[model samples]
Target: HSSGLVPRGSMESGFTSKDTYLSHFNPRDYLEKYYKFGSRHSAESQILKHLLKNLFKIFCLDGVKGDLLIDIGSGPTIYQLLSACESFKEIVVTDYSDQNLQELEKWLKAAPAAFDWSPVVTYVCDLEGNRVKGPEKEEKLRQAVKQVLKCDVTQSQPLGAVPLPPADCVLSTLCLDAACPDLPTYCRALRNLGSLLKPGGFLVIMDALKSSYYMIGEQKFSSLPLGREAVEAAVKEAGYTIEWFEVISQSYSSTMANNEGLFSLVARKL
Candidate 1:
């Protein structure tokens, strides 16, 4: 969290494409390099398990039911999402990087029992586009198809390529600290989520508040810090009430699992 406010590439000289902006947040590479299935002790798996349980609570699954959920900046093979497939009719997982999507597809294909299902859909889309779809070259569409679309979230008038009827829940994890460069941008993303949700919908967020450095084999990457109060204000301004919020603690190291922590933000749409 001590890292500068810039996104991954911004720390380097010269301009980087918006698609390449949040490279560190891409977990596909990390999963390939260090994570392995059935390795409950692995850092990535541990993180996912921790995040999924808390987010599931936000949906109030025992109390209410939703048809669909949209995971923003969803990274490699959403094992976390798979945990809740039975609760929703459909789940849309999206990311801007093709490589990330490919990894997710590979994971689903290779591990069918773990991921393949009629209700789950995977696609890649740039959240920065004003319209979600572009050339056919893009595997993910700008418009909603089967309940998901690639969105250009950075645009001034960024709406999904297709008119998305509001969903029952909007979920995000580890996005703002890596995808958003500044506080206002973070707020914009949260507020923008309002556009994608139905009234009285659910919102689940899992973010890294301070400790920004994470392991990727021999390399280490940085994540930015988000002032809790600022993020809370954004949540409220977006017309959501905080159902619960907490920072869970854990430790993860390749050799023995050293230090790890994450924050969960759960709310209901007004």
Candidate 2:
């Protein structure tokens, strides 16, 4: 019989390693559930697409073009970076799990996956005021991404075994509240992320707000509950000054996720 770690407490939580939660995590299931974009779009799908496109489009508007944009804990999806490619000439995508990285590799290589991000690419292109240039925008990002490094947000040097120059921008979306276990750790992760940025570089992050739990396949992962105050404090504590921050309300069924909404912020390292 296959044995799994079990906790013996009423709180009902389990310890996690860098690789623990990913043991059962499936990128295919994750994409299918959260990002199955087609003609039939859901409320959450439109909400997420709007949120990312809006935030990154503003980054482009700010005229913060750079040579390097490092993505921290980039999941198996590229939706968040669709707009990012416009400003950053070279991008580095990082994740803790090899599975997620492999998925990115397949997508970059145009290999078939369980899902296609064609619609997502098109949507972001539309946001760029060129719906007909979806393929152009898509290929542009494919070339902009120059590296896919393994990252651990808990460490000061997130890119283990590989050293990279401080990035002009570091992009992290919907990752920290899932990657970290508690408040202090989350703050530490923010600082660690800060270490990767050049002084005055931009840090763009989007995360679930006050989220308790979300599911992937049959696996349910916990989201660290964060309020706007906490987020403000954390960013400031991480040697950053907030350039902009926004939180939009959301109401999802408890079974899918208990997050009240999502938040996106742009900060600059000090």
Give per-model TM-scores.
0.70, 0.91
- Model 1 is weakest, by summed lDDT over 10 consecutive residues, at 118-127
- Error (Å) of candidate 2 at residue 31 is 0.6
Cα lDDT listed for each candidate: 0.55, 0.78
Where does candidate 2 stray beyond 4 Å? Answer: 1-17, 39-41
**lDDT (Cα, tens digit) per residue for candidate 1, span 99-139:** 56655665444453333322122111121222343233122
Query: What TM-score would you give candidate 2 relative to the actual structure?
Result: 0.91
CA RMSD per model (angstroms)? 9.6, 3.1
How many clashes in each structure? 13, 0
**Cα lDDT tens digits for candidate 2, 70-90:** 989887978878888888889
**Candidate with best lDDT:** 2
Question: Alpha-carbon error at 157 in model 1, in Å?
Answer: 5.9
Model 1 lDDT at residue 183 = 64
Which residue pairs overlap in candidate 2's backbone?
none
